Amino acid sequence: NKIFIYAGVRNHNSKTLEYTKRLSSIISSRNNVDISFRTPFNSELEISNSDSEELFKKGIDRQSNADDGGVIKKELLESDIIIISSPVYLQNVSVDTKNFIERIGGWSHLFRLAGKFVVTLDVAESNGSDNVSEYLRDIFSYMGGQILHQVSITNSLKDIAEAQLMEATYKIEDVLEGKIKYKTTDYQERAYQTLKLILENYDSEHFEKMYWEKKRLFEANSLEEWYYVE
Amino acid sequence: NKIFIYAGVRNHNSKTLEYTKRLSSIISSRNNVDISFRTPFNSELEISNSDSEELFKKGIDRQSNADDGGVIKKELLESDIIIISSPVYLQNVSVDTKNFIERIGGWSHLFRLAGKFVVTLDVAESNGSDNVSEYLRDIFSYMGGQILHQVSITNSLKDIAEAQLMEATYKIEDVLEGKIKYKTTDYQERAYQTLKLILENYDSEHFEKMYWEKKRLFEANSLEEWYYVE
Ligand SMILES: Cc1cc2nc3c(=O)[nH]c(=O)nc-3n(C[C@H](O)[C@H](O)[C@H](O)COP(=O)(O)O)c2cc1C
Ligand SMILES: Cc1cc2nc3c(=O)[nH]c(=O)nc-3n(C[C@H](O)[C@H](O)[C@H](O)COP(=O)(O)O)c2cc1C
């Protein structure tokens, strides 16, 4: 299937990039897949400068058509699996990882990643791994993606890095083999019910509300039902 | 006194920028201070691309002298009070706020902000405020700065915004008046004692270790003692 990978790092000697490349190599060496590997080195994503009003109320995004933002969104929507990797810089995601996320912020309340499987990878010296994995988990999960697996590599436990990447590969293979099917979590279902109540009182011209109506997100008992019934 | 301000926002219609400009005006309208207001609109900070090895082990920074990073560091070290503001984008600091922080990542374990008073401001629509304020608090505090005050403005409670900004001003004025003196927290003392033990086994050629030696960070019983003594 199609696998989209993005590593948010600009350091030429990045260990995050190295491990991410290693992961990609393992997957393709064991499976016949179409991988799209993107980084700040081969993809240009200008820093997000959008305004809440235009972005959410009007659904306007002028940047994506000016750089690689557009093609990235297309590949994301066309992928079966998404792999996001980030270095741990000052106990937080890297600048490029944060920008990647802000560049798709418009999907924050649209569950556009519903049906996709997300794998996260973060690399640190010895701390901050948990805060980064948790932030990535929450963001992509909120967007509707299923967190298939998360990996945190640390120099402290570098000897298990290969084994950790191999374990991620096994999870991915279960998806490629059709052994794992998209399933929403309680956290996601609650987020769904919560957002619906808010968007229900929004103006009829509000882009997000119109999107929900057009996608029939309102006429559904749950997020999982919506996905499999619509 | 000298006050350094940085708003990490690239959105022309930013409410964060507007609220930060308001705080700046309030302060200068009641006090004689030297304010340096920087943002991505008047300052150039390339996205951080540093490598841990070179940055911490060798103390190499190849970007600061290439753009506005150098002058920003100088103003930070010369300032008495530091004000950092950030929009709340997907429950995290903005891309530019994250970059600002990474661009001074080299000071992570040097306590170079010891003696400075930090004020943070984050602006959100309705949520994610606490995660952003808590992150800024931890980062700047860990770097030695005293968190003088924190403000979280939300559209949900926009009616108290002015009052919130006035409260920040009073805190700042007490510093300018010389009422509040720099004092470390238990969080910082523990970080200090913890770092020392680590940098004690480091190679004699390690930049961070040599820095602590030259600054006499080793010959001290506590971080606060170190500050008022050395
Ligand atoms: C500005 C900067 C901040 C960093 N902060 C942390 C951190 O908070 N925790 C940690 O364990 N390692 C930290 N590191 C070390 C990296 O996590 C480590 O080098 C890892 O390999 C990821 O970075 P890389 O992809 O650039 O190699 C930092 C590195 C830099 C350059
Ligand atoms: C990409 C993007 C994601 C955002 N995420 C959040 C969020 O997580 N929580 C919230 O309450 N507001 C969120 N907002 C709304 C902003 O917090 C609000 O507009 C605030 O004024 C700060 O942004 P501004 O400085 O650009 O005005 C988001 C806005 C954008 C452009």
- What does R_g of chain A's alpha carbons equal in angstroms? 18
Contact across the interface for B13 and A49, Cβ inside 8 Å:
no
Contact across the interface for B11 and A51, Cβ inside 8 Å:
yes
What is the enclosing helix (H) or strand (E) of B173?
helix B161-176
Nearest to B135 among A10, A92, A94 (CB): A92
d(CA A92, CA B8): 16
On the 0-12 / 13-18 / 19+ scale of CB atoms within 10 A, A24 is buried
Q: Compare all CA atoms of chain B with the CA of A13 and give the residue at the minimum distance.
A: B51
Q: Is A179 on the interface with B (CB under 8 A)?
A: no
CB burial readout A56-83, b (16+ within 10 A) else e: bbeeebeebeeebbeebbebbeebbbbb
Assess contact for A125 and A119: CB atoms under 8 A: no
The torsion angles phi and psi of B48, rounded to 5 degrees, stand at -55, 135
Assess contact for A147 and A120: CB atoms under 8 A: yes
Quote the tokens at residue B105: 């990542």
d(CA B229, CA B218): 13
The torsion angles phi and psi of B194, rounded to 5 degrees, stand at -70, -45
Q: B102 contacts in A (CB within 8 Å)?
A: 89-90, 94-95
Q: Is B108 on the interface with A (CB under 8 A)?
A: yes
d(CA B48, CA B45): 8
**Which of these, B63, B61, B44, B42, lies nearest to B53 by C-alpha position?**
B61
Distance A7 CA to ligand 1 centre (A): 14
Question: Distance between alpha carbon B80 and the CA centroid of its chain, in Å?
Answer: 11
Quote the tokens at residue B2: 């000298």
Residue where the block lists tokens 């999982």: A224
Could you tell me the CA-to-CA distances from A223 to A73, A140, A184, B36 in Å, in that order? Answer: 22, 15, 7, 49
Per-window interface: B 14-43 vs A, CB < 8 A? 14, 40
First-to-last C-alpha distance (Å) of chain B: 22
Q: Which domains does chain A have, with CATH numbers?
A: 1-230 (3.40.50.360)
CB burial readout B94-113, b (16+ within 10 A) else e: bbbbbbbbbbbbbbbbbbbb
Torsion of CA B50, B52, B55, B61, to 10 degrees: -10
Picking from A17, A93, A94, A95 by the largest number of B CB atoms within 10 A of its own CB, the best residue to mutate is A95
Assess contact for B192 and B111: CB atoms under 8 A: yes
Q: Per DSSP, which regions of chain B are E strands?
A: 2-7, 34-38, 81-87, 117-124, 146-154
Question: DSSP class of residue A6?
Answer: E
Measured from the CB, is residue B16 less than 6 Å from ligand 2?
Answer: yes
Distance A16 CA to ligand 1 centre (A): 9
The experimental method is X-ray
d(CA A74, CA A156): 37
Assess contact for A229 and A215: CB atoms under 8 A: no
Q: Ligand 2: which atom is nearest the Cα of residue B16? A: 25
d(CA A165, CA B194): 31
Q: Compare all CA atoms of chain B with the CA of A93 and give the residue at the minimum distance.
A: B98
d(CA B176, CA B98): 28
Q: Ligand 1: which atom is nearest the Cα of residue A18? A: 25
The torsion angles phi and psi of A92, rounded to 5 degrees, stand at -160, 170
**Which of these, B42, B48, B34, lies nearest to B2 by C-alpha position?**
B34
d(CA B150, CA B182): 16
CB burial readout B152-163, b (16+ within 10 A) else e: bbbeeeeeebee
Question: DSSP class of residue B151?
Answer: E
Measured from the CB, is residue B105 less than 6 Å from ligand 1?
Answer: yes
- Point out which residues pair with A124 in neighbouring strands: A154
On the 0-12 / 13-18 / 19+ scale of CB atoms within 10 A, B52 is middle
d(CA B179, CA A54): 45
- Point out which residues pair with B147 in neighbouring strands: B118
Distance A10 CA to ligand 1 centre (A): 12
Distance B96 CA to ligand 1 centre (A): 18
Say which residues have a Cβ less than 8 Å from residue B87's Cβ, sequence separation at least 6. B8, B9, B11, B14, B15, B16, B94, B97, B122, B123, B124
d(CA B20, CA B99): 19
Quote the tokens at residue B59: 């103390």
Q: Does residue B111 come out as left (phi exceeding 0), alpha (psi in the -120 to 50 range) or beta?
A: left
Question: Distance between alpha carbon A128 and the CA centroid of its chain, in Å?
Answer: 20
Contacts 24+ apart (CB under 8 A), A164-170: A165/A19, A165/A22, A165/A23, A165/A26, A166/A26, A168/A23, A168/A119, A168/A121, A169/A23, A169/A26, A169/A27, A169/A30
Distance B128 CA to ligand 2 centre (A): 9
Assess contact for B217 and B196: CB atoms under 8 A: yes
Quote the tokens at residue B214: 């030259």
Tell me the resolution in Å.
2.0
Question: DSSP class of residue A55?
Answer: I
Reduced to 3 states, what is the DSSP secondary structure of residue B76? helix
Neighbours of A202 (CB within 10 A): 15
Residue type, A31: N
Contacts 24+ apart (CB under 8 A), B107-110: B107/B143, B108/A90, B108/B56, B108/B142, B108/B143, B109/B56, B109/B195, B109/B199, B109/B208, B110/B143, B110/B144, B110/B208, B110/B211, B110/B212, B110/B215
Q: Does residue A115 come out as left (phi exceeding 0), alpha (psi in the -120 to 50 range) or beta?
A: left
Could you tell me the CA-to-CA distances from B211 to B143, B200, B217 in Å, in that order? Answer: 15, 12, 8
On the 0-12 / 13-18 / 19+ scale of CB atoms within 10 A, B204 is exposed
The crossing angle, in degrees rounded to 10, of helices B129-142 and B186-199 is: 50
Reduced to 3 states, what is the DSSP secondary structure of residue B87? strand
Q: A91 contacts in B (CB within 8 Å)?
A: 135, 138-139
Residue type, B139: I
Question: Distance between alpha carbon B59 and the CA centroid of its chain, in Å?
Answer: 20
Contact across the interface for A139 and B90, Cβ inside 8 Å:
yes
d(CA B61, CA B134): 28
Residue where the block lists tokens 């680590």: B198
- Point out which residues pair with A150 in neighbouring strands: A120
Pocket mutation for ligand 1, best pick of B46, B52, B198 (most atoms within 8 Å of C-beta): B52
